Amino acid sequence: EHPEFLKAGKEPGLQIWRVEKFDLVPVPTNLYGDFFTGDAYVILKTVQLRNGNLQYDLHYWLGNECSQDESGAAAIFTVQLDDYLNGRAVQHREVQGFESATFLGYFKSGLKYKKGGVASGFKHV
């Protein structure tokens, strides 16, 4: 029922969202591959299966300086998206500087890092 869940994995391709203050916000398609190191992202790769179905790989990417609420949310969103896709996604934790070969493979001009990002959603006690 979340707008972005409805849009997730409808066709082959790559979808990227950024965790922004406890919400999943779509990343502009022109900005794909440029990751803020202070933020966390959810990445869904959808592949056409010969069987007509779609193959799903969910990757949650964690920037070196992302806050606990962002890394926590990215993980939970991953579980929820996977559940939404009837459990059929394979889940991958991707840490800045240690990303898997297949994840790095998604970005044809190579992925790049940039310092900064959106502020934490947490209220400080």
């Binding site: 919400d23 949650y60 609420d69 939970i76 991953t78 579980v79 889940q91 934790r93 006690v125």
Partner: protein, 358 residues
């Protein structure tokens, strides 16, 4: 704003969803001569009978638990519970009837508009930014190993060890008395708990440390008592938490936490074991001992195939990991429809919790 309450055997951790920490942390104790809760119950213990409504992570006294919850809402958080969706936590393998009871009380006694119950160990894994791993959760009353894959615990592989903080406090009391001091009374128990939390650590190699302790004074520490007297603690510093690895120290035939962790992993599907070894997450107050992570890394390495990638994760905030995971979960835009509502409870009754809350 939603509320998050994490009820343990020894401590209640409560607060507001979206906060980075619980605003209320207090002893899970109810005293009766018409009732006192927490710290105020402890200070007046000479004139009342104290009871712990939660034993080994499981609620066993529902009358007293209601008082804990009432005190949490009104005295600690100062909220009208009827205004706030409330997330509660539960132990691994919490009986079905207990889950239903929890639900019944929240809607029927406190009249919350919405509620949810989550497994404590799963919330801690989420707090570490993980969907797959094995949690070692050790508090005041109980220790669990909980393997989790793609967001969900594997019930068949969960291990329970009835040895935690309380036993370690009592043991440190015994070995300090054996050293030459006398820690025996309920007031002396509270002092020893502070020594435990301040001076104890886990030795990387226990026998080597026992040799260093007997030949030198380099491992000795001084502690000032409330009366002003200064005492010296030696090998007791590391002998106390060694009990976690060698439960025979208190006359228990159970395997140590390193062996239960291995055993838990080995009960899981062979295809996920690598992910488990690489994601050992520690949570709870009893995992706070300096050196515990380094020792677990060493012990699991000795148990596993030599080529296995092993990683122990011990966040500084792991006393409150369960609570923080709950705070994050309840704050998510996607969590809004996941709550059990008052309407849904009225339609379906308490059994709704088994369908809405894994």
């Amino acid at each position: 704003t939603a509320l998050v309450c994490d009820n343990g055997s020894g401590l209640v951790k409560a607060g507001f969803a979206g906060d980075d920490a619980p605003r209320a942390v207090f002893p899970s104790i109810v005293g009766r001569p018409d009732s006192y809760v927490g710290d105020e119950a402890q200070s007046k213990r000479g004139i009342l009978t104290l009871k712990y409504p939660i034993e080994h992570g499981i609620i066993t006294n529902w009358d007293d638990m209601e008082k804990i919850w009432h005190h949490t809402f009104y005295n600690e958080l100062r909220v009208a519970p009827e205004e706030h969706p409330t997330l509660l936590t539960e132990a691994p393998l919490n009986p079905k009837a207990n889950r239903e009871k929890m639900t019944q009380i929240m809607f029927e006694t406190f009249n919350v508009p919405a509620m949810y119950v989550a497994i404590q160990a799963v919330l801690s894994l989420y707090a570490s930014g993980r969907t797959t791993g094995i949690v070692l959760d050790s508090g005041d009353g109980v220790t669990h190993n909980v393997p989790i894959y793609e967001g969900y615990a594997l019930p068949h592989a969960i291990m329970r060890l009835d040895l935690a903080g309380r036993d370690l406090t009592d043991y440190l009391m015994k070995i300090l008395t054996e050293r030459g001091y006398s820690f025996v009374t309920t007031a002396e128990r509270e002092i020893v708990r502070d020594i435990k939390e301040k001076l104890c650590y886990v030795a990387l190699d226990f026998e080597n440390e026992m040799a260093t302790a007997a030949s030198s004074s380099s491992l000795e520490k001084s502690y000032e008592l409330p009366d002003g007297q200064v005492i010296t603690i030696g090998n007791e510093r590391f002998r106390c938490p060694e009990t976690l690895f060698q439960p025979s120290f208190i006359g228990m035939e159970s395997a140590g936490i390193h062996e239960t962790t291995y055993n838990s992993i080995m009960k899981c599907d062979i295809d996920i074991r690598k992910d488990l070894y690489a994601n050992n997450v520690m949570s709870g107050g009893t995992t706070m001992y300096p050196g515990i992570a380094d020792r677990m890394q060493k012990e699991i390495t000795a148990l596993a195939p030599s080529t296995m990638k092993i990683k122990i994760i011990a966040p500084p905030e792991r006393k409150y990991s369960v609570w923080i995971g709950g705070s994050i979960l309840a704050s998510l835009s996607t969590f809004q429809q996941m709550w059990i509502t008052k309407q849904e409870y009225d339609e379906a009754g308490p059994s709704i919790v088994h369908r809405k809350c894994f």
